[PDB]
Amino acid sequence: GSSGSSGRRMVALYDYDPRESSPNVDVEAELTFCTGDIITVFGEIDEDGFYYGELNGQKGLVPSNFLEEVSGPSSG
């Protein structure tokens, strides 16, 4: 029963929109999440300043300035 911790689940601190915030640069790849939407990022920030995670079964980019490493006191 191997689990394997892949990427980190981040909690969208503030709704994002590559249709307004983003300068419209290949947004077709960027991910559109909302406040609270959990996104699993993989790897460190790129040269630009974004993260590579997956959402609702979609791989794209996500602004680290709109996420927060999820950390809760797991008791059980």
mmCIF file of C-alpha atoms in Angstrom:
data_model
loop_
_atom_site.group_PDB
_atom_site.id
_atom_site.type_symbol
_atom_site.label_atom_id
_atom_site.label_comp_id
_atom_site.label_asym_id
_atom_site.label_seq_id
_atom_site.Cartn_x
_atom_site.Cartn_y
_atom_site.Cartn_z
ATOM 1 C CA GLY A 1 0.000 0.000 0.000
ATOM 2 C CA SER A 2 2.424 2.661 -1.210
ATOM 3 C CA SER A 3 1.169 6.245 -1.000
ATOM 4 C CA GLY A 4 4.037 8.342 -2.326
ATOM 5 C CA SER A 5 3.739 12.024 -1.449
ATOM 6 C CA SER A 6 3.672 13.812 -4.805
ATOM 7 C CA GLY A 7 3.613 17.596 -5.022
ATOM 8 C CA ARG A 8 2.015 19.771 -2.353
ATOM 9 C CA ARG A 9 -1.651 20.725 -2.004
ATOM 10 C CA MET A 10 -2.069 24.504 -1.877
ATOM 11 C CA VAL A 11 -5.200 26.410 -0.863
ATOM 12 C CA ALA A 12 -6.216 29.255 -3.171
ATOM 13 C CA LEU A 13 -5.968 32.271 -0.866
ATOM 14 C CA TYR A 14 -7.680 34.456 -3.465
ATOM 15 C CA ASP A 15 -9.693 33.608 -6.580
ATOM 16 C CA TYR A 16 -7.497 33.753 -9.682
ATOM 17 C CA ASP A 17 -8.325 34.573 -13.302
ATOM 18 C CA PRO A 18 -5.843 34.394 -16.210
ATOM 19 C CA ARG A 19 -8.377 36.407 -18.207
ATOM 20 C CA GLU A 20 -7.802 39.573 -16.178
ATOM 21 C CA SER A 21 -4.727 39.229 -13.963
ATOM 22 C CA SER A 22 -2.608 37.453 -16.575
ATOM 23 C CA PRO A 23 -1.441 39.549 -19.556
ATOM 24 C CA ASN A 24 -3.003 36.862 -21.751
ATOM 25 C CA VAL A 25 0.173 34.896 -22.465
ATOM 26 C CA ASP A 26 -0.729 31.326 -23.415
ATOM 27 C CA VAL A 27 -3.351 31.427 -20.660
ATOM 28 C CA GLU A 28 -4.825 28.430 -22.480
ATOM 29 C CA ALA A 29 -2.416 26.493 -20.264
ATOM 30 C CA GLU A 30 -2.846 28.484 -17.052
ATOM 31 C CA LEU A 31 -5.330 27.144 -14.501
ATOM 32 C CA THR A 32 -8.424 29.040 -13.365
ATOM 33 C CA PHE A 33 -9.084 28.338 -9.685
ATOM 34 C CA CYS A 34 -11.086 30.161 -7.013
ATOM 35 C CA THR A 35 -10.681 31.147 -3.362
ATOM 36 C CA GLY A 36 -10.341 27.863 -1.497
ATOM 37 C CA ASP A 37 -9.797 25.652 -4.534
ATOM 38 C CA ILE A 38 -7.031 23.192 -3.660
ATOM 39 C CA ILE A 39 -4.281 22.798 -6.256
ATOM 40 C CA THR A 40 -1.505 20.200 -6.211
ATOM 41 C CA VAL A 41 1.692 21.940 -7.315
ATOM 42 C CA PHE A 42 4.792 20.039 -8.425
ATOM 43 C CA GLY A 43 8.351 21.327 -8.195
ATOM 44 C CA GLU A 44 9.643 24.772 -7.260
ATOM 45 C CA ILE A 45 8.696 28.106 -8.827
ATOM 46 C CA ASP A 46 9.839 28.629 -12.415
ATOM 47 C CA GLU A 47 12.017 31.464 -13.716
ATOM 48 C CA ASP A 48 8.862 33.465 -14.433
ATOM 49 C CA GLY A 49 7.277 33.008 -11.020
ATOM 50 C CA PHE A 50 4.502 30.439 -11.352
ATOM 51 C CA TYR A 51 3.815 26.886 -10.183
ATOM 52 C CA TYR A 52 2.971 23.694 -12.071
ATOM 53 C CA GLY A 53 0.069 21.830 -10.497
ATOM 54 C CA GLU A 54 -3.117 19.971 -11.394
ATOM 55 C CA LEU A 55 -6.768 20.874 -10.816
ATOM 56 C CA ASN A 56 -10.093 19.203 -11.604
ATOM 57 C CA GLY A 57 -8.014 16.879 -13.763
ATOM 58 C CA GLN A 58 -6.215 19.683 -15.582
ATOM 59 C CA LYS A 59 -2.473 20.350 -15.725
ATOM 60 C CA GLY A 60 -1.326 23.951 -16.040
ATOM 61 C CA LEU A 61 0.260 26.882 -14.221
ATOM 62 C CA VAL A 62 -0.740 28.606 -10.981
ATOM 63 C CA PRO A 63 0.464 31.850 -9.348
ATOM 64 C CA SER A 64 2.146 31.120 -6.015
ATOM 65 C CA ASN A 65 0.910 34.559 -4.964
ATOM 66 C CA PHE A 66 -2.577 33.040 -4.882
ATOM 67 C CA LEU A 67 -1.849 29.870 -2.908
ATOM 68 C CA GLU A 68 -0.750 28.823 0.580
ATOM 69 C CA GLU A 69 0.936 25.562 1.575
ATOM 70 C CA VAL A 70 -1.816 23.618 3.340
ATOM 71 C CA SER A 71 -0.822 22.718 6.899
ATOM 72 C CA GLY A 72 -3.241 21.220 9.405
ATOM 73 C CA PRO A 73 -2.824 19.376 12.724
ATOM 74 C CA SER A 74 -3.675 15.857 11.555
ATOM 75 C CA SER A 75 -5.218 14.166 14.592
ATOM 76 C CA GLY A 76 -6.508 10.648 14.017
#
